[PDB]
């Protein structure tokens, strides 16, 4: 969840992620997880506030161990009543050296242990005061998890509100540029070929320096290329801009710059300091 700031300054959000049913991920970063949020605007359009987020993460080695301590060993009202009743700290010392192999936890299996040993663990269980039935259930559970597999069953049944949720937080604060303006160009396809049927990109950029430049590029086409060299009159408004070309080319190079950030400063009348140019085929 994304947090509106403590000023409660009417920054509206539209999207938010509550994975109630999909309590399921894997984050080796070759695959990409992306979360996006649609912040809206208030009555006033400002720059800096505080933003935090409630990442309610967990660990897979908590989840599969809470499955293994409640289904594969102690799923009865007798064994968890008398056999592993008060010796649970020995189980919580036995669990944290298990090293379950997670490379096949999401490829046709789950809870398949790696190549540890069990004779030293059995000798440690014998050297304490463990009973024969409790050692029978524990040796049966470790014998089953010597080589095992699982489906996606009990993905939340074996952790249905029986787990901690280490709710982290961070601070993102809506970074902004230097100069704010608004242009509007005017395209005219004086094409050397017939038409390339180009596909649009109505850009809206920003620039953060002083005595600077805010360049732009035209649309990208896919027909017989290096052509449709358009005609353009600038018609920039509410500023004192610069120029790069009149009647430029939509070829392999475009280079339609506008170095307007060397002058004509203004206020931060938007959420940041931007410029949204928009050409039109006329």
């Amino acid at each position: 969840e994304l947090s509106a700031p403590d000023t409660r300054n009417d920054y509206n959000i539209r999207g938010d992620y509550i994975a109630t049913t999909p309590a399921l991920i894997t984050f080796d970063g070759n695959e990409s997880f992306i979360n996006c949020y649609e912040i809206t605007a208030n009555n006033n359009f400002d720059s800096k506030d505080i933003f935090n987020l409630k990442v309610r993460y967990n660990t897979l080695k908590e989840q599969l161990d809470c499955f293994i301590t409640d289904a594969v060993l102690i799923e009865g009202d007798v064994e968890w009543f008398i056999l592993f009743e008060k010796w649970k700290t020995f189980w919580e010392l036995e669990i944290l050296k298990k090293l379950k192999y997670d490379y096949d936890a999401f490829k046709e299996n789950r809870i398949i242990r790696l190549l540890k040993t069990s004779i030293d663990l059995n000798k440690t269980k014998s050297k304490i005061r463990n009973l024969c039935i409790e050692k029978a259930v524990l040796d049966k559970i470790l014998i089953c998890l010597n080589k095992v597999s699982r489906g996606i069953a009990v993905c939340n049944t074996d952790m249905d509100e029986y787990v901690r949720n280490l709710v982290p937080k961070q601070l993102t604060v809506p970074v902004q540029l230097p100069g704010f303006e608004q242009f509007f160009h005017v395209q005219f396809e004086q094409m050397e070929t017939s038409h390339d049927a180009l596909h649009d990109t109505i850009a809206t950029i920003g620039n953060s320096l002083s005595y600077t430049v805010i360049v732009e590029n035209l649309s990208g086409q896919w027909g017989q290329d290096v052509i449709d060299d358009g005609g353009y009159i600038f018609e920039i408004l509410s500023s004192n801009e610069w120029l790069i070309h009149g009647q430029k080319r939509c070829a392999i190079k475009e280079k339609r710059k506008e170095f307007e950030v060397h002058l004509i400063p203004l206020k931060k009348g938007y959420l940041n300091f931007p410029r949204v140019e928009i050409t039109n085929i006329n």
């Binding site: 539209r14 999207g15 992620y17 994975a19 999909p22 991920i25 695959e31 990409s32 997880f33 992306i34 979360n35 996006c36 649609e38 999401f106 490829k107 046709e108 489906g151 996606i152 049927a197 596909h199 649009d200 990109t201 109505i202 896919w222």
Partner: protein
Amino acid sequence: SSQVENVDWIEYVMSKIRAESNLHSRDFILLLLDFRNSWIDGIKLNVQFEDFTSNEYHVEASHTSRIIVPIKKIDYKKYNFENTPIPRIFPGRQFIQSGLNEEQTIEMRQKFWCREHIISKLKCNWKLTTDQSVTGSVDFNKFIEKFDHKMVYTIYPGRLFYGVQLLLDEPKVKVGEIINLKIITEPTSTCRRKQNSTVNFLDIVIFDSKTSKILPRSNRRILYNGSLTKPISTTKVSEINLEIIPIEKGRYEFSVCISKSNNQDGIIQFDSENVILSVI
């Protein structure tokens, strides 16, 4: 679109996409077959399927004319195509061992039974030009030689590993509508095959309407809340879902792809539903 109703096989699937709107498009297939005459006369060649009426064709002395006959698919949960295979004309006989693998027997049963299904409703009719009396028909039993693996995919959808359908509600989306996409998955009659993998992985891929291959970080484009892997259950239905917040372009297509693991080239089904949405 309208005014294309000047071509004989268009108006069949137009006339059942106007009425009976459950019977959708992108599932009607065309079977394409070329006549060729070994004769000096013209032949007039009106083809009937169970209700399709081709117009008055003409084949002169060598000129092939590929008839484009539109049919529907078949439903794998409606017919069983694993029934007693290659039934003998006369009961009894020696009863010798088949001498073939059971899997081979499966594909021989499918490649026979789909062939007789398209035999059983296709009737040509014809008449000569220079006489206009000696009408006739043909039968296609000696004509259709066999099927191969493209044909048994295209008529029979149950040869595929999975069968999905996927709908996006209200395709006119302006800019700011986070809208869930709905996927309905159902494993086919080849749910009996593998069964040692119990999970398969479903990449949802994003195409532009005109150009191709939108990169998955996807700025100024569809943004997605979640991720595009979403593992699915073998032998049960599973309704995956993903929310699309679009930024700015014209139109896009969604499709899925199933891959049996997460390594390279373990990929099994290049599936092709491809719904398009329109964004202002």
